[PDB]
Symmetry: C3
Subunit: 572 residues, 3 copies
């Protein structure tokens, strides 16, 4: 609607712009005592804008319409422009430093912010930091705008007035800000800069010396020591050492994990030779029963006389142990073909080789909770000798007399470990005689009608079952799992610590002591400038003073910044 | 054949060698307008060989017979023999350094090349770099060979003639080459070297100062500034800053790796209590039908009135969604035991406890395309109350009247998510009343003659099925997968950035400004040598000039290299 | 018992303590010499204690009772105390620094040791290092204890007596120990310290110069060079370069990890359309038969005329290849429903669309041995055209005439690869005409009463089977697996090498040459102190000598340490 209204009338769209332009030109020109105010206003506007975007970034939160993000970008276009105006207003010749350094300190930020959000989000918290850095420059900038009025030399002097409080601010910015900033000063006079860069460093230290002299003289006392002042520096140092030492301690365990694993599914089979399996069963909820403290106490009472068993058991909490209450009636009909059933009967009776009887278990775990290996499994096998009693009795079951059964000794390992890895062995500490400690199993063949041929399925039970012969309770001890191992290979972990200690050493080693630089610097502050000058001549700095002489060619305004040094030199 | 021919005649194999040796001995004794040429020729030969190997390495490509690699190694043996071989000319006394010179700059390379190829290959591209480094030394070396003729001091002087162009070459080699090279000079006089090493650094800077003086004087102008020269340095600096800033921005590139996941297999079951499952079905191609844009539009129309549903749906492209057209006739015969069948009928009719009816789903995905979790699954359960209508009606189905059925309300969750993890929940945004929004299922028993009992299987259908009652369409929304997460733990990612910013800071911090060193250096170049000498005496360098005095003991030829400094000193 | 005895009598517990205390106060002051001996004894005790803990840590080995670890900690409490009293009552009244630097050099260690053990163990080997560092300080400390007697200045002087042997010891400690130690000296006079720190560095070099002068004068010869001395430095340098080239090259050190993979389980199915599968079989041990060298030779003879086949085969050792001897009688009864059976017969005969016949294979591997992908699989499908001979013949089998069969050409791919990834394709190099090279399969339906309808199962055999028609031998070539890939993404691996070369470069670059510092330092050693003093005045060091003047205010004992410098200055 509003867009349409602008479209509807030609006059509103145009002429107006021209008028505005005229105002900007003439106004900026006619506005005798002002433009300076306008520059301040423009700086204020920028700060406000930044806040809005900075405020906007923090404020919206969460995730915002994809289109909305585009609109903000469109909005950013606006910010870039406007500035375009005053850009060459202050601006470049009068103080290009404006649109200049300031101009750079935004384009980089804009690219990062779009990049930072990605699809993941959380960019803004990283992003928000960026806005603040821009803002700090702007606050300096707003005064900055009347640069010819502002006088670059004057701003530094005021901090000198600030002294120790002023000195702290200079320290806070640090080298990195200075290096970026030094370059802009370098950019105006790059060739000197390389020469210039050394001077700026020198100046900084000289400024530091003056600050010490200032508040120091009032502060200074002769043959006077204060315990409290010493303690704060020393207590902090001890804390810093602790953090360096503590941090290594802090991370040494920064890694860790531990959550209970219970197989979701416990699948067991009984299979004779290569014949279709006799029995299959898969237990799931609620047939997989976690140990209560009562179950744990009963298990502990059972194994109390045996320290090795108790040492094993004590590694597990009740929650780490389940009883899989395995139903003994096969879950599926026996699917054997008639010729193979006949072959099996014949092999059992008449075979001259062993026949293998295999009991398998396979425990499934939920990887969503942790761990890396979904299934852990193993098997127990028995070789049934030719003509053996159990073998003939098993064969006899096929004749279909319902009251008959066979006992297979040492078939069922009751206690099994389900570790993090894929091999789940019966627990030797609880079954130290191995297979001799496995339980006997009574096997029967069930047959229903039918009609002669009938459905068939196999039923197993523990030989010594009492209260619940339909169940074969398998006790499973599951080691806990963790999402991340952390260190992984030992060598890599060791190297990182060495890098931490080595890298650390290198950084610690690097600062060193600048005895040569210090001696020249130290004398001058205590030293008189003339004495320093006599001192000064041997070092290059006296030569630099000579370069001061070149100053004479240099333009006076640029000379003045150089001149400030002479005042500094006079102060020296 | 050729090998046999050499074997066949004794004379060709021998005497010849002796003659060759004699010739070699004499060639040294020729001795003038020859041996020097021979040294140059030998250097040429070496360069040629390298290229051949360098040419050979790049040229062969791909993977080459294992035996062929061995032959090349055998060939390398030949090269080594020739080198050290002729090494008795330069050599061990005269062109000592030159002699072994490349001696070191080859053995290290040979070990790496064999190591680099491994079984993976691609070693040569890494490998090829190595040959070039050897070659560069050789080009210097070939002139090098007449070392007594060559005069080490003279070669440095010519670069001085080169000046600014010459200066660039010196800069290009860098510190690392110099440190390795400095040592060889150090090796001849190691004790001085430690003293010597400082001098070489000093010399370099002195050489740099001369170069600046040279082309600089013609170049130099008074009170003259060129915008173009400044711009190139500054534009590059901005680009460098951007790369530093851009590179951090660029890294985000990593974050990315999306591809569609559709379960290959959709397996569902319906199971009453612990009884053999009534119904099982596994849908695979082409029963798993990806959404077309038409299907997506129809789904969008269905859920249009509901913003939360539409917000869910909009997260998926048609390719991310499938309809599993589940066949409602069980894929397997019911395998129950008649006794268990009798128990089930009795429990349904007469049981005083609830009985659970469970509908399960399990979606299999192809890990070869991406992702980490192959199966994602869940279940819906209903507790059928004792004496409830549905329970009695289900029991009635066992009597085998083919026209009968039972409806179980709220059994089939039509809309399910198949996320990256192992838990696949029905979509609440599309089914906000949860189980009340699941679909009713009509169940029938298909018992068939036989002959008593009749082969049995269960058939399910959606209660409100219209056009395709044989199908139960389950709509599955699969989140995309990516091969690599990248950052993994948040702390590690943050640390790397800090290291990048911290490490970066450290490197940036390290260069610093050498004000003390610069001041001494700066004065001398502008400064006259005598004035510098007066300046010179206080620093150790004047003392070094005094060491020059030791030169007198030192051998004159070794003295001359020292002497060059005096000429340099005179130049100073 | 013993604890009870102390409890039983009041007198033993008390009065005694008081007496001891009295003695200690009495012990400290009384005999001319005795306390100094006591300080030495206390230092000895500490060393002994350290050894015991150090001895104890190494000695116990393995893992020790959790309670036992607690007891040791309780023991450590004891160690801390004893000094508790001596902490300031021993007492380092004068050399307070005693309970100082020494006190610090233990608390950090104690925290680390507890942290180091964790639950993993192996902490002690890392832990043991810590004890030794404490011990070294203690040995210095024991003499240290009579600090007023000891004279800090005197200890440094003795090393001067040691000279070159003495010098080596100073070098060994390195910067890191000094920086920590410098601070303690700094702590007494921190403000000077910053000034002081430069002096200590200066002193070190001055000490080094004296050592060179000492043994050097006897050692020194004029115009004399020894080959052997040069060789050791140079040979070591070459070795160091090799280590950097060979040591740094020690990167590939992590490039290998594999053995043999044979599928534990080979599962195959034959399925017509969506009907219940006709045939399923899972082969496991010992039906999965690894190739012998005889089998490998026979396979090589079979494929000898074909270079591409032989190139494929040569990539595998016999151990990498198995024959899965697949039983051709289905492992399960056919579970189809009559109509599912009637529908199938009708579709085979009367259908107007194609019907799909699918042969699948799925190979299971043991991840515990290595690898990442447990199952690898694929399938071969044939579209049986309407009214085709094979389709009608298959339908005919359902009528139950036992002598009948159908041949399906090109159904069984004999040679299949089981690679590291999830897709297991038939080997094209051994079957270049693809499906035309797959083997024909003869299918039969087995069915027996009962006694119309009697159990059914399907039997397949290779069309051209001769000796073992019950088996369908599938030859499977499995690529080896390794536990760790290592490099992973190419860019990351390249960056590390660059960091290794770049990082390395940076460290190599960093040392540089200190020409300015060296020149001042070099002149003084050769230079006379007076001449040096004339030399000395221009540098800050002469100013430092002036600070020496402040010494006058400073306390004489603290002055003496400063005074030692003057003696050093006199030596200069």
């Amino acid at each position: 609607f509003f867009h349409d209204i602008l479209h509807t009338k030609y006059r509103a769209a145009t002429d107006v712009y021209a008028l505005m332009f005229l105002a900007d030109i003439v106004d900026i020109i006619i506005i005798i005592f002002g433009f300076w105010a306008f520059g301040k206003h423009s700086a204020a506007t920028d700060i406000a804008s930044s806040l809005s975007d900075d405020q906007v970034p923090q404020a919206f939160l969460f995730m915002l319409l994809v289109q909305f993000g585009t609109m903000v970008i469109d909005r950013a276009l606006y910010l870039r422009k406007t500035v375009l105006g005053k850009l060459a207003f202050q601006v470049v010749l009068v103080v290009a430093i404006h649109i200049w350094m300031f101009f750079i300190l935004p384009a980089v930020t804009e690219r990062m912010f779009s990049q930072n959000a990605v699809a993941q989000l959380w960019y803004f918290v990283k992003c928000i930091y960026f806005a603040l850095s821009a803002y700090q420059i702007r606050c300096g900038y707003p005064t900055r705008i009347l640069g010819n009025f502002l006088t670059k030399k004057y701003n530094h002097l005021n901090l000198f007035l600030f002294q120790g409080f002023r000195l702290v601010p200079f320290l806070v910015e640090l080298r990195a800000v200075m290096d970026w900033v030094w370059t802009d000063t370098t950019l105006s006079l790059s060739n000197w800069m390389c020469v210039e860069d050394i001077y700026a460093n020198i100046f900084i230290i000289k400024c530091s010396r003056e600050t010490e002299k200032k508040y120091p003289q009032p502060k200074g006392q002769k043959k006077k020591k204060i315990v409290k002042y010493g303690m704060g520096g020393l207590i902090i140092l001890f804390l810093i050492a602790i953090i360096w030492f503590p941090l290594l301690f802090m991370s040494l365990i920064r890694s860790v994990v531990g959550v209970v694993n219970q197989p979701i599914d416990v699948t067991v089979t009984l299979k004779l030779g290569g014949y279709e399996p006799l029995f299959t069963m898969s237990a799931q909820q609620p047939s997989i029963v976690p140990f209560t403290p009562q179950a744990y106490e009963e298990l502990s009472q059972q194994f109390d006389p045996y320290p090795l068993a108790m040492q094993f058991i004590s590694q597990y909490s009740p929650e780490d142990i389940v009883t899989a209450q395995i139903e003994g009636s096969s879950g599926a009909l026996w699917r054997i073909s008639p010729p193979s059933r006949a072959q099996m009967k014949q092999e059992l009776y008449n075979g001259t080789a062993d026949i293998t009887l295999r009991f398998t278990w396979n425990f499934q775990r939920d990887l969503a909770k942790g761990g890396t290996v979904e299934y852990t499994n193993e098997k127990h096998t028995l070789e049934l000798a030719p003509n053996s009693t159990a073998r003939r009795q098993l064969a006899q079951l096929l004749e279909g007399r319902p009251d008959q059964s066979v006992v297979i000794p040492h078939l069922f390992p009751k206690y099994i470990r389900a570790p993090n890895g894929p091999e789940a062995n019966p627990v030797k500490q609880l079954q130290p005689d191995e297979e001799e400690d496995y339980l006997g199993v009574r096997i029967q063949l069930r047959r229903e009608q039918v009609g002669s041929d009938f459905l068939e399925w196999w039923v197993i039970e523990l030989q010594d079952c009492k209260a619940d012969c339909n169940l074969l309770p398998m006790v499973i001890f599951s080691d806990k799992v963790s999402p991340p191992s952390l260190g992984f290979l030992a060598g890599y972990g060791i190297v990182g610590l060495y890098v931490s200690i080595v890298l650390v050493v290198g950084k610690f080693v690097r600062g060193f002591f600048s005895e040569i630089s210090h001696s020249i610097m130290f004398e001058e502050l205590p030293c008189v400038d003339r004495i320093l000058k006599l001192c000064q001549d041997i070092f290059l700095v006296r030569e630099t003073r000579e370069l001061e002489l070149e100053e004479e060619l240099y333009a006076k305004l640029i000379f003045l910044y150089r001149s400030p040094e002479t005042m500094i030199k006079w102060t020296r």
